[PDB]
Amino acid sequence: SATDAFWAKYTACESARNPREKLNECLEGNCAEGVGMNYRGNVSVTRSGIECQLWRSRYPHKPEINSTTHPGADLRENFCRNPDGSITGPWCYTTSPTLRREECSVPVCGQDRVTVEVIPR
C-alpha cells in the first residue's frame, strides 16, 4: 500500500479518531471500532467455543479470503480478523467441519463490552 495504506487505517479508525487516546488505541490492534476493521488482536476462538482454523491452513474449509487478496487485513495464522467489512464483526473460519465461519467475541474500544455475546458451553 502506501497512501492506500493510510486510508486503510484511517478508514478503519474514522469513528475513534479525534482524541489521540481514542485514535491510537484503534491503530493499536486490541479492540474493535464499529464492525472491527481496526483489530490486530489475539483471539483464536469463535464466540461459540470453536477453535479458529489457520488462514493458510486450507482444510476443513477453503477460504475465499486469503492473505493473498487482503493485503490489507492481518491474516496472521488463525487469529480473528474482519478483512471484508462484516456487520457481525472480526470473525474466523472454524475448525468444526460444519461451521465455515463464525464471529469472535472481542473487546470493543473505549466502551468496553463485547462485540457479540459468547454462546454457553
Swiss-Prot record:
Residues bearing carbohydrate: N42, N66
S-S bonds: C13-C26, C31-C109, C52-C92, C80-C104
Residue ranges that the Swiss-Prot or TrEMBL entry lists as coiled coil: none
Residue ranges annotated for the Kringle domain, each copy included: 31-109
Descriptive protein name: Activation peptide fragment 1
Portion of the full sequence shown: 79 to 199 of 625
